[PDB]
């Protein structure tokens, strides 16, 4: 689509739960609480992947909660940061399934986003060191609305729903209009229960080619 986030989120920006979330996060930053990612990065998934360009949606939960790590994309870390263990498991699955994929020397996934992979955490900020610390704000309400708008306004998006939380988040999606694939989370805590072998990266590309669209090149590139 020519559709943009601005076309469908302009009124959502004015909703009380959204305004209260931004105001709470801002007040915490002001009071000296370190919150990740930085304010300028919080909406980078939307900056890098416009609504009409979404081809694949991969949900996460929280941003990484250590210094310099999160930058507004699920799974990805800034250049120079050690590869997170869940992303390492994604790289292992990729190297086992995509012809010519080789282990990257970084974890920075902007180049996935620029190809139409929406790397959406369901909660968009976190206090330093403290997983789920911003879960009680309105981010899940916001990202529920984002998923509902992709479901409504697009056709044929691939959703890769990894783990229980992401699968529940995607329970609404129309499974005839879109292509929903489920597996365990790639975290070491669960990957051996079926993430390895899920073949989701190949399956997403097979769908895209059956739709007459270009596949994702899953090898990430440094800027």
């Amino acid at each position: 689509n020519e559709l943009t986030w601005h076309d469908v989120l302009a009124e959502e920006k004015q909703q009380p739960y959204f305004l209260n979330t931004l105001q709470t996060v801002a007040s915490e930053r002001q009071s000296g609480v370190t919150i990740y990612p930085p304010q300028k990065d919080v909406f980078n998934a939307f900056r890098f992947t416009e609504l009409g360009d979404v081809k694949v949606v991969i949900l996460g939960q929280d941003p990484y909660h250590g210094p310099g790590q999160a930058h507004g994309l699920a799974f990805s870390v800034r250049p120079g940061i050690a590869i997170p263990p869940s992303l390492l498991n994604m790289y292992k699955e990729l190297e086992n399934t995509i012809p010519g994929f080789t282990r990257p020397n970084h974890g920075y996934l902007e180049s996935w986003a620029r190809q139409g992979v929406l790397l959406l955490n369901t909660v968009l900020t976190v206090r330093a060191g403290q997983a789920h610390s911003h879960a009680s704000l309105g981010w899940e309400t916001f990202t529920d609305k984002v998923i509902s708008l992709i479901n409504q306004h697009r056709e044929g998006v691939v959703f890769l729903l990894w783990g229980s939380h992401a699968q529940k988040k995607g329970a609404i999606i129309d499974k005839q209009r879109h292509h929903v694939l489920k597996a365990p989370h790639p975290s070491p805590l669960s990957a051996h229960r079926g993430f390895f072998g899920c073949n989701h990266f190949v399956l997403a590309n097979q769908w895209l080619e059956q739709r007459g669209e270009t596949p994702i090149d899953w090898m990430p590139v440094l800027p």
Binding site: T4, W5, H6, L9, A10, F43
Partner: peptide, 4 residues
């Protein structure tokens, strides 16, 4: 900082 909001792209919409």
């Amino acid at each position: 900082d909001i792209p919409f």
